[PDB]
Amino acid sequence: MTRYDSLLQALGNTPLVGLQRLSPRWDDGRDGPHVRLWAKLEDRNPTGSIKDRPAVRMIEQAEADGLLRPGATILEPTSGNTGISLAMAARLKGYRLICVMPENTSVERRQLLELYGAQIIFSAGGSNTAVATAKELAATNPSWVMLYQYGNPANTDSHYCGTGPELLADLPEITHFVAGLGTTGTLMGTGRFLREHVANVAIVAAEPRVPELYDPEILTARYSVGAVDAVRRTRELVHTEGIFAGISTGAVLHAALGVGAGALAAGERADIALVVADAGWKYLSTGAYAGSLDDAE
Amino acid sequence: MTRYDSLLQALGNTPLVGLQRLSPRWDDGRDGPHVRLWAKLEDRNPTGSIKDRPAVRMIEQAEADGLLRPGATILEPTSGNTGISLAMAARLKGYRLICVMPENTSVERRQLLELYGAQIIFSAASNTAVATAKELAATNPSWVMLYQYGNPANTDSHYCGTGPELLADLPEITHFVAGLGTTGTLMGTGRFLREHVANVAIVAAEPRYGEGVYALRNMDEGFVPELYDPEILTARYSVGAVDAVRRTRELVHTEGIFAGISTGAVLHAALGVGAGALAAGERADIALVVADAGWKYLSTGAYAGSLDD
Ligand SMILES: *Cc1c(COP(=O)(O)O)cnc(C)c1O
Ligand SMILES: *Cc1c(COP(=O)(O)O)cnc(C)c1O
């Protein structure tokens, strides 16, 4: 019933929790209708990040497209959650994973990925060269199935088929979905879903100031979020609501809170679902949660 | 379905996941019966640690005992998971939390509590922290010390949560393995399981004397926690720090589960117990607690290079 044979079954169905203290207005009142933030706690996933969804889907789809025979190696240009997600996803699914990432990459990140069983190959430039290094590696070697998070539709699909529905199920009265925009899968996937099922839903992109998965006709809005607002929001979230989200959630919160504030001001009702893509746990080391908002980090 | 008005409702019903690769024998073979490890993922709780269960319980029980009126302060001598849990739980429940901890305690720990809303008062030269929290709580009628080491609600949160959940998910359970810190988990889930499944083994993973294992306490080392009932435990597996870390590394590496170090101790116990069942040809369903995730322990360096204290 909550018994799984594999950690993989423990994927998605992440809780959606109301932020009573953070919501502009939790209860409908004399002063107007409720403006509610609901956090979709994607950290409750296997590796503790939203990406388990795309990672598993990417893999499963590769299995389906027959791209992926037993014991094959998945090659992925990533150093973070996607890598973690895939490391656990791959290994649990009988695959090996190699992450391509720049030589520059922080020991922590890679020490992490190594921990989860990923093999590492180094790129050289930034992430692009990795995505580009990984693009040549994949190509130089047939044995290696590059899943490519930034372009694999299965990424988007994982939200179209998990996050979205789960959201709609828990929050039929949703008015706003706010999620970070990296790969774009979440907003595109959960985005497309929600737009198909609830009319006038807002799909709000939190971009932390062109993804192959990006679709321009899905996002309704795009908040650009400064790193300071992100951290302060992250700080506020855990401080106020007891949820310890990673930094990207700060972005989202900020957007959600913005969107919240507009709806409050407009006396409109808002049930805003916002994604907590991941926990702060990974981000502690950054020093971001303690100290000056001044974050040279 | 899984929609919550508060984080507090997203407490417990933690997933129980089979460790098919780490299990001594996942599949029953016409030769021998299966010996399965199932990991109760307690890190899937609000603050990411089992403690959210006794934290909440302890508060609601204090609410219940009328100890704890609105905006009262919870005073707890803690600097770890229970603090975090409480910090989350108290705030959500409209209380304030002060953690009493030594002046010695790591910025990391304190900075963490601070971020969850806890107020910090420092003790001095962990034991002296208790007296101070207590002497400090026997002084303001509005400062309520929950005292995880003795508060029955702690035990009770596993008697009422962890234990039932397990049994619901693993009616075939033969073994419960958990760390022994405050003792709540083993006591509570221990008592529960003992009462509902015959022969169930409650196995304490206990750091070896000297070897610190985060979260875990050896019963001979410090104060025996007031909650501790020897009769409950079926066995105590001593576990060295190195096995705990190597086990935590194996767990993530083999099962993709990134657990805190106390889990490694538990895994080690579970695996030992598993290996005895295997060897004896006994069927084992061993549920073992993953009290928290590895995330807080990265900083420790416990997950780079295996020798390192
Ligand atoms: C991947 C990720 C995002 C952004 O999600 P995209 O789907 O890819 O748009 C945000 N936050 C965290 C923690 C992520 O891992
Ligand atoms: C508290 C804790 C334990 C032990 O729990 P008790 O209820 O004291 O038996 C084990 N592991 C971790 C990570 C803990 O925080």
Swiss-Prot record, chain B:
Biological role stated in the UniProt entry: Catalyzes the formation of a covalent CysO-cysteine adduct via a sulfur transfer, using the thiocarboxylated sulfur carrier protein CysO-COSH as sulfur donor and O-phospho-L-serine (OPS) as sulfur acceptor. Can also use sodium sulfide as sulfur donor in vitro, albeit with less efficiency, but not thiosulfate or thio-nitro-benzoate. O-acetylserine (OAS) is a very poor substrate in comparison with OPS. May be of particular importance for cysteine biosynthesis in the persistent phase of M.tuberculosis.
Gene Ontology CC: one annotated term: protein-containing complex
Gene encoding the protein: cysM
Top EC group: transferase
Record annotation: effect of changing residue 217 to A: 700-fold decrease in the rate of the first half-reaction using OPS. Affects neither the rate of the first half-reaction using OAS nor the rate of the second half-reaction using sulfide or CysO-COSH
Entry's free-text remark on domains: The five C-terminal amino acid residues are inserted into the active site cleft in the closed conformation, protect the aminoacrylate intermediate and are involved in sulfur donor selectivity.
Molecular-function GO term, any one: O-phosphoserine sulfhydrylase activity
UniProt xrefs under CDD domains: CBS_like (cd01561)
Assembly behavior: Homodimer.
Residues binding pyridoxal 5'-phosphate: 81, 181-185, 262
Binding-site list for substrate: 217
Family: Belongs to the cysteine synthase/cystathionine beta-synthase family.
Assigned keywords, A-Z: Amino-acid biosynthesis, Cysteine biosynthesis, Pyridoxal phosphate, Transferase
EC number(s) given by UniProt: 2.5.1.113
Pathway membership: Amino-acid biosynthesis; L-cysteine biosynthesis
Phenotype when the gene is knocked out: Strains lacking this gene are shown to be attenuated in macrophages.
Record field: catalytic activity: [CysO sulfur-carrier protein]-C-terminal-Gly-aminoethanethioate + O-phospho-L-serine + H(+) = [CysO sulfur-carrier protein]-Gly-NH-CH2-C(O)-S-L-Cys + phosphate
Protein name, per record: O-phosphoserine sulfhydrylase
Modification type N6-(pyridoxal phosphate)lysine: residues: 51
Pfam families: PALP
Cofactor(s) required for function per UniProt: pyridoxal 5'-phosphate
GO BP field: cysteine biosynthetic process; cysteine biosynthetic process from serine
InterPro entries (UniProt xref): Cys_synth, Cys_Synth/Cystath_Beta-Synth, P-phosphate_BS, TrpB-like_PALP, TrpB-like_PALP_sf
Induction or repression: Up-regulated under oxidative stress conditions.
Superkingdom, taxonomy of origin: Bacteria
